[PDB]
RNA sequence: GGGUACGACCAUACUUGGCCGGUGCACCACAUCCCGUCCGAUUUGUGAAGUUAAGCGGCCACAGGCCUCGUUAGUACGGCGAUCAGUGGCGCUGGAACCCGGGGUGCUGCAAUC
């Protein structure tokens, strides 16, 4: 399916003040499912490191952004995630797929599983493309090779739904249902 | 600008130890009387020889304290929420203190006065 989260990049600031007349502009990758989501995460992260909070903040762009093409590609994601078992592990997956979106989400998937980690325990540290050599992690270098070939076997191969059937005869395709 | 009296706030004005120095302030002289003590030390009355030593006030403390703001720290804790997890995160939120550091170390009022 479609990457489960979209790439806003959130860009806001702590109000401008006469405390601050001209407050620094933050930008804040956010991998999230929606902008509302996104907006949310950025202002986590600027009362839990610039200490300005939401209501003395603003947004200033909720912007998605752009996918880098659509070439099949290798992705070093490096993801922060907490637990009561684990309370911070850095830790740089690397995961290999078409888009820093479909990477960082496929990394919450990955990482949702082999950590019972919820989407708001887990925080991308940065998502970098890498080229093939870099890839210190043996998984994704099986598939470098430009001659890679692999059989898809023991496939289950469900019919096109308009034509799935409950009884068929047996040495045939006859529905009986 | 300072001094006096009476002050308001009552340490930024406090403690310590320095140094600094025209009205007055003070110390200072004596106690006859008013008046009071074991004692004129205190207090009281009467003075004006002496001196600023002190008090006083002002300036200095890698002074302490106090005040102020930052750091601490979006930390601690906290309110609300979840068919959350197994105390904790999370979501929405409020949010310190100790500490350390920068600064600071009284200010205003009436009255007569140099």
Not at 38 to 58: I, L, P, Q
């Amino acid at each position: 399916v479609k990457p489960h989260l979209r790439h806003y990049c959130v860009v806001g600031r702590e109000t401008p003040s006469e405390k601050n007349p001209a407050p620094t502009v933050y930008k804040f990758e956010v991998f999230a499912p929606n902008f509302v989501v996104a907006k949310s995460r950025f202002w986590r992260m600027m009362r839990e490191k610039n200490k300005v909070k939401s209501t003395h903040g603003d947004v200033l762009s909720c912007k998605v952004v752009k996918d880098r093409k659509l070439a099949a590609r290798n992705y070093s994601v490096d993801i922060a995630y907490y637990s009561q078992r684990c309370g911070y592990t850095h830790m740089v997956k690397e995961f290999r797929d078409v888009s820093k979106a479909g990477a960082v989400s496929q990394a919450y998937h990955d990482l949702a599983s082999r950590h019972r980690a919820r989407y708001h325990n887990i925080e991308v540290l940065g998502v970098k493309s890498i080229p093939n050599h870099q890839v210190k992690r043996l998984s994704i270098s099986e598939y470098h090779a430009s001659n890679l070939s692999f059989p898809l076997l023991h496939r289950r191969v469900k019919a096109p739904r308009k034509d799935r059937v409950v009884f068929v005869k047996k040495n045939t395709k006859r529905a009986v249902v």
